[PDB]
Amino acid sequence: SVTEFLKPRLVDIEQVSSTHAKVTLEPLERGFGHTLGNALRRILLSSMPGCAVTEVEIDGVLHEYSTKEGVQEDILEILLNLKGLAVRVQGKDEVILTLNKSGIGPVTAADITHDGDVEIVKPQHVICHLTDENASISMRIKVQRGRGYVPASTRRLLVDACYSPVERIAYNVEAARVEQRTDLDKLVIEMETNGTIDPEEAIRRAATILAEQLEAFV
């Protein structure tokens, strides 16, 4: 009568697509919605472990503001395309992938030569387009495991590291009514991931982490 609280009873999971999910809980005590939503957002944006590309070496170009012949996309566009690559690595902190292509065609993520450990979620992802038969492009990409977001400024071209699998988090709190009381909060959370892990799965991981942060006081 003094210690118990309103545990959520309805958990509604709506899947817009494979990587887009919307999760709803109700009811929660007055004010617990904001606390849980904020804790999950902060722990998701900058604490989820993951692997991503850090730096890339291209034999053709040695400077950021350079141009590669036969490729209408600039080096900056190449780095932006490399940013979104979704790679999962099993048991290795650092790996190097070497990519070679020649001829005319849009360079796909599948063109990378990878071992059993390295796996690419989206093979059809495009890096750059080749418009010349003579045009051949080869580079080396480095994938490392880390946490959160790492800018290139705080750091052979350097690329920002999107370690965290999650991409966008946004929560909202509505009013849900139980019998006479109405001030109880209903949390509706919305998330989208790059594709490495199931959207609703990620939340679980996040939750576990926060629980593991409180083992010394329970």
Binding site: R41, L45, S46, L76, L79, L80, K83, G84, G148, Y149, P151, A152, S153, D160, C162, E167, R168, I169, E192
Partner: protein, 50 residues
Amino acid sequence: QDVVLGLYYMTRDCVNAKGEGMVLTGPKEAERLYRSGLASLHARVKVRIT
């Protein structure tokens, strides 16, 4: 009134601010930077848009 001031404060560049001069994949990524506090709410950058 209040809404207009919010939109005005949103879209107004500063000559220098935290995280100025970088490149972002999309609007979805840009929201991640602002919430993390790693970049200022208004600083001129280059973003891919569709």
